Design a protein around this ligand. Sequence first.
Ligand SMILES: Nc1nc2c(ncn2[C@@H]2O[C@H](COP(=O)(O)OP(=O)(O)OP(=O)(O)O)[C@@H](O)[C@H]2O)c(=O)[nH]1
Ligand SMILES: Nc1nc2c(ncn2[C@@H]2O[C@H](COP(=O)(O)OP(=O)(O)OP(=O)(O)O)[C@@H](O)[C@H]2O)c(=O)[nH]1
Ligand SMILES: Nc1nc2c(ncn2[C@@H]2O[C@H](COP(=O)(O)OP(=O)(O)O)[C@@H](O)[C@H]2O)c(=O)[nH]1
Ligand SMILES: Nc1nc2c(ncn2[C@@H]2O[C@H](COP(=O)(O)OP(=O)(O)O)[C@@H](O)[C@H]2O)c(=O)[nH]1
Ligand SMILES: [Mg+2]
Lengths: 432, 432, 430, 430
Amino acid sequence: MRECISIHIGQAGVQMGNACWELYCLEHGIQQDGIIPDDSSFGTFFSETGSGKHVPRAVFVDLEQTVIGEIRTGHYRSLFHPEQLITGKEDAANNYARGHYTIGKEIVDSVLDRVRKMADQCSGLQGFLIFHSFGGGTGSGFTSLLMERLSVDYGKKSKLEFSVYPAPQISTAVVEPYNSILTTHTTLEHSDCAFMVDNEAIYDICNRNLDIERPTYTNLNRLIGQIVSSITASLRFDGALNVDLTEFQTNLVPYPRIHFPLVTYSPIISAEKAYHEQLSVPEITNACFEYSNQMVKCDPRRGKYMACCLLYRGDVVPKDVNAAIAAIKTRRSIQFVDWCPTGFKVGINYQPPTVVPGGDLAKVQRAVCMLSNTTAIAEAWARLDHKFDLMYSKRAFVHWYVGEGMEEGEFSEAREDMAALEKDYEEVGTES
Amino acid sequence: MRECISIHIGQAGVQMGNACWELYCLEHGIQQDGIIPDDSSFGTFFSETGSGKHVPRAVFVDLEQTVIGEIRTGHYRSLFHPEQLITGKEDAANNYARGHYTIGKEIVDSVLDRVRKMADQCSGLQGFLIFHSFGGGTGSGFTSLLMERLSVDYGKKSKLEFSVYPAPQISTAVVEPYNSILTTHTTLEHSDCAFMVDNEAIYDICNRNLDIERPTYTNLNRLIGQIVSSITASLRFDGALNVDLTEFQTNLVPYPRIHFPLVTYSPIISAEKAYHEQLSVPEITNACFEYSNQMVKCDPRRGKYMACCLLYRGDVVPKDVNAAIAAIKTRRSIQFVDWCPTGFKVGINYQPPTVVPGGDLAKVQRAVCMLSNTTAIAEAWARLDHKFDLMYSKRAFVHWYVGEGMEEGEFSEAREDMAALEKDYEEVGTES
Amino acid sequence: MREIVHLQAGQCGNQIGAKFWEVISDEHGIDPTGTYHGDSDLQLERINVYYNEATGGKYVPRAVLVDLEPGTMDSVRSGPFGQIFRPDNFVFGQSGAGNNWAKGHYTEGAELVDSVLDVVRKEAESCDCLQGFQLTHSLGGGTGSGMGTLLISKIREEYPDRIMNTFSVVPSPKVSDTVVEPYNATLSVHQLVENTDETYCIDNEALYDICFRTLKLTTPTYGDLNHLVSATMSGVTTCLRFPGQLNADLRKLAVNMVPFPRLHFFMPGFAPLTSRGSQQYRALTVPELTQQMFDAKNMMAACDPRHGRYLTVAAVFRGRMSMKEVDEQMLNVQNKNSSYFVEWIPNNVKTAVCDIPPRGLKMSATFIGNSTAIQELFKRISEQFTAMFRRKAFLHWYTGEGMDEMEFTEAESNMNDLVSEYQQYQDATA
Amino acid sequence: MREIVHLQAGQCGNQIGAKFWEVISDEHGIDPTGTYHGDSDLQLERINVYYNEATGGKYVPRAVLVDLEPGTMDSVRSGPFGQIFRPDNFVFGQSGAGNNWAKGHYTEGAELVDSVLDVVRKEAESCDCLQGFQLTHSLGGGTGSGMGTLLISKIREEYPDRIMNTFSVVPSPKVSDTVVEPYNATLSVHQLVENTDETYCIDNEALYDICFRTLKLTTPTYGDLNHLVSATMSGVTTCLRFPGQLNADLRKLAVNMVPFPRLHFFMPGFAPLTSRGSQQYRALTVPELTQQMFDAKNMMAACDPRHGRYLTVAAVFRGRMSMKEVDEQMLNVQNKNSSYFVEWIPNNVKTAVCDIPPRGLKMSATFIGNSTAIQELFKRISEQFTAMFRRKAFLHWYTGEGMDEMEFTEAESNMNDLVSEYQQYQDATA
Ligand SMILES: Nc1nc2c(ncn2[C@@H]2O[C@H](COP(=O)(O)OP(=O)(O)OP(=O)(O)O)[C@@H](O)[C@H]2O)c(=O)[nH]1
Ligand SMILES: Nc1nc2c(ncn2[C@@H]2O[C@H](COP(=O)(O)OP(=O)(O)OP(=O)(O)O)[C@@H](O)[C@H]2O)c(=O)[nH]1
Ligand SMILES: Nc1nc2c(ncn2[C@@H]2O[C@H](COP(=O)(O)OP(=O)(O)O)[C@@H](O)[C@H]2O)c(=O)[nH]1
Ligand SMILES: Nc1nc2c(ncn2[C@@H]2O[C@H](COP(=O)(O)OP(=O)(O)O)[C@@H](O)[C@H]2O)c(=O)[nH]1
Ligand SMILES: [Mg+2]
């Protein structure tokens, strides 16, 4: 199978990626020095060279020099091609306008050049994985730019992303609703499907299952690394019933706008706690169908599932996966919409996970990642829309935007667009 | 293959040559002491002797004793025949008239004698490579003299030159437009094709690709050494699809006056930066077709290419060169004129480049130099003509010339001649 | 990258400045002679954020020292830490303002401001990407109030886009160290609301309340109060100088902490603060730290936050810490004191975490607040101003240096509007 | 090769001359006894550019010293550095001019000029290729103004082709050390515009402004001002004496710096200039160096370039340097101050780089400028001249030595035209 390009935008995406690429190095046994120790898989995510040093096929962009500087000076400095690390001069300062209109465009073209110079050097190409956040300038405004530009230059190719959605109650910035909605509007028409994640839900899981009292960003971003490696496992490792990258959108996207499947991973168990667990197929399969196991803090029983992919990993029994899924289809609490009787998409790859040195999670012999699309996520959008209405009703932060080349009417258009999305979910939530 | 004669006129040409001849010494392993260490190639650029000391087949002329004195006293003193180093008493003082009418003619005949005494001692002869500048007295006025004299005494033999064209905005003298246009007029009718180069573009490249913050003349003139060695590679080293010296003009000169192909070289990469690059044929071939890779700061997309030579070097795959060039012919941004469907001229020599001891550029296993002729260069002439009109409209510097045996009407004739050249490009820029 | 050029005016500004540079030199590990002697490579990666470089490792901080008379500057140059500064950056007059705003802004400051601008521009052109300007002054004085407002306007005209924040000492509620503070204070605010992006109001009485209450150090000289102020301001710029999990920026704080353009007056806060000796009987975990940021007892502004309501709040943490608690506690804080925050803003807390804590500590949080309770301060100044101006108490010292009493009325009217604007947001939604 | 013969006239010329030869002997490493003791072979390769050779290594500089009275020359011969000069080259009269132009040009200088020419020719025939002549004098005096203009004309007649440049001290704007400066100054300009190729105008007041402003050395005697002038003039001739990346020439500067024949009056500049002690807090990189060349503060001509517009500018750098910056900064300089340059010249900056910096330094740039603002100087002299000549203030001292007042009117009329010609180019294109 063939190549994929990973774009890491903003502090969150850039910081998340460094953890993700640590896994790829471990799985294929690539040295942090870049030189593979003395096979057909790494070609998808790594570029060959005359020497033994493989070059990762990804680009990092961040208007603030600080974040990339840590990578550019960290022990992984030699792994990345120096010209792939694009850095501006000043930060976007959490303002959507700066990262999209004034300073985002001053460096966007340079990023396109390297991607173009990178996409041209792959005999095959699947799509893009874009890592970013919803609550920052570079990770929200610059993302919207690249979705537009990459859509034009490389349209009709898959465009996937993993976005840190604003958590329900915990908040890390004041202008998250303003910046969160804006990027959503511009990215709906130029994206395939977004893999939402919340730090609140992940924190809730980490203190609950993993059983470590004091998590950090350096900890959580690694779990987000596992979902990516499991998602991209088909493109690298052989196994029965593979699932190529272009397959995700077809199964998980009944409608063009409705492309927000929240991520769910299992089993998250610590090394010590695992010795008293059996890890049967229904056990791990059942873990994905409860409020207590989500990367987004949306109560699934509030809504109805409409598409679910169970990308199994490691030594797995297809017979049990077929049987385990069948039971979940016949439980009253679980409720698939009326119009999608065919609501599962199984995928198996014969490569059990690999543990990061010193990693908190255990060495599970078998793993599964669920990518269910549920109408309960409309609550997250509904709550977010409530926040935006409260602030913009008083016009309490617009001035920071109008001064950066963003017209007043954009805010009104976005919410009205989001309001239609709210109704779109409601219509799909019923049966004609 | 047989001999070529290199003439280095002016401070720029003389200083550029010393870097060029350092390469020839390295490639053939000739000692700076002149004695070859204890084959059929060096006969083209070097003259044999009874002893093991080979004599370079070039002449150096500079009205200012200072520049040649450095060579005549530098560590390369013994390499050059003492009588080949021609020096006057006083400088041309950036005045075109002095280097062409009053003091240029006082020493021109002596230069002709040594060339005549040198051209007579070569069983075969290809042509001349003349190194000079556009913004000096000796390098502009004395050049025009030798073009006239050499044309008469050795007419119908190739006359090539590498000229440091005045950069768009950076300027090193006040009277560059006056001196730049004058030499152009007199050299159009007595030259085959000129290889334009700009220090601005080279500086832009050096800080951009080579990644050294503080370049100097001693640095840039070496890169100009690479283009010369690549251009003259066919005359020395064996390889499939050689390209003799007389071949350049036929492919690159559709019309007699239109003989200004700007130089472009690739790949310019530092020793450290190269370990993360693959250097595939399309990669190096693609580098030559963008505004960011030129020795002359003319935006190629403004104009249309009308002739292009890709003189490949080192171990190369003719199949890929054929394929790589074909793709460039089918891109909308790239636009060859309508009347030249046959717009490529490939040449391969089996001799990968050699690195100057301590050189900044890397040890590329494969190299290519492009000599595209484009209508965008008319912008450089158009801008230069604008400068001349502003000054001569006020007659603000003519007095320094009229006092050195140059009539007033010469300035008017030159611009009117340049104006026709501007229209000549415009007519060729369209289709009948 | 994001260079900061520091401006200090007035006796209070220079003295706070002088202490302010001692700590940053300490954090980066810079010798008083200007030679770097730190132990962490992260100190040199960003040493250009404050310090220029002259050959030989001599790092010359780009601070601009201006006072209308040589008094305070001479002490700085004679001080142990005074050799570090560039001799040219010092700008000194020969007749200091007599605490009156007019002389230091119109007749005397004007003759000297042009000289200062000549040096500030040289600092601006020497930086590849000059982030913004930082000013330390005092409203009560004449040199700090007058020339600071004169200079803040001039730098505003040349570089409108850049950030321009200020740390100012504000008149105390019941004590006044200058008779004509309300006149200088009111005049200086009028000229600041229109030109500065943020202002960290502080007052000595509130800072005095810290010295003996939470710390136990009677007889705290100004040299110690400035250290608290020094530490707080160095916290705001930490992310620009050291890596972190969630980096902040001078513009990041401005966007979050300023809902409306005029309402940019904040009031700072710092922790941990504990007296020596008794320090060992207290824990340094995040929970107790956070509670210390949301109580009036640890507010450096005399106005008590309880009386008013919070609009926006930014907590800039430092050191190795659990990001969960750094955000779990904020959520609990907001629900505990929901009445203390306005309803029309769905969330008000801004969190930033840095990797390098302050020198000699393993945890630090510079609190910043934008509460409506500050209106009480400006209302108090309005009460004092109208009393004095109702009888032209001291107008003759001002009108005698090229000024008209019409300006006093303009400043009073503008001040009242600022108070009114804060009041309008006391009410809840709908 | 391109030998220079130095001419010095007047007390100011000899004193500047005397210092001027100390530095060149220092640069080439020549012992005061005339014996070369340098350490670089590049000092002997071009030692013939200034110094003749007598057997035994005794290098005799080819300077011609002329003063109408033995006063100043006797001090030079008695000075520590006076033994180097040839005894014959000294030419001395017995009655010095009393500051009046006529006596030193007509009645007394005439009796002595022929003697000087007899020695200048011997120097000219001894050089294989005599580039040109260099004159150091002062307009205010009588010997420098009179005999210098008398001699500059005579050498002009014999060698019209060669360069003939001059360094002259020009009357200060508000101070005058001689009562009749306008008469001598105006008379000397009339005779110079018609005979000299370039003139580097300098004035003591402007040079005084350097001593205390950028340097910090109060009580700068003339012996120090001459050193600044010494250094600048030695920079102009550097390329003739040492190798470089982009060599300059006395004729190169004349071609670039002189658009029209009459408008050849320049005003020099030098860098780096910094007071001892404070030197270590400043960097020596190219950027800060270039800005120091395009500010009035470092101009040795009292006229401020800001008031006028630049026509042509030449920067002669020295030492190992990045040619990129040596040309990148000029482009940025021109765009920053585009209003300061006339539009009818597309580019105005001339760059030259040499390999050997000044002794005791690793970087140096002798700025040269041709700005219209100099017209203010000549206009000022015109203002003073018309005032005095309107009443025949001192004409009797002049007409009494074989002169007619008609000459004064001719000189005044010519001076006014020179001012007018500069003014015509104030306007923009079309
Ligand atoms: N999972 C994870 N989330 C992160 C990380 N870093 C930041 N975030 C989240 O990203 C959001 C903040 O956005 P940032 O990425 O820091 O901001 P940015 O993209 O750099 O945008 P500006 O700094 O405003 O230009 C918050 O929701 C954070 O919780 C990380 O390493 N991992
Ligand atoms: N590439 C390169 N360009 C040079 C070099 N030296 C000078 N130049 C360029 O040449 C032009 C100046 O002309 P010069 O060759 O120095 O002048 P010259 O030919 O000696 O003429 P005169 O000195 O006036 O007699 C400018 O555009 C310089 O940038 C060099 O070593 N390499
Ligand atoms: N924190 C602090 N405040 C000071 C210091 N010195 C003076 N102040 C305050 O500044 C005000 C007096 O202003 P000052 O700066 O002396 O007047 P200026 O010289 O005219 O600006 C009073 O409110 C003082 O409390 C100091 O060292 N530290
Ligand atoms: N720079 C400099 N200027 C001087 C020196 N001595 C005199 N002058 C100036 O020369 C002028 C006086 O001319 P002077 O040469 O004494 O008269 P002369 O002997 O008749 O030519 C005044 O403008 C002085 O400022 C000196 O040593 N250095
Ligand atoms: Mg030359």
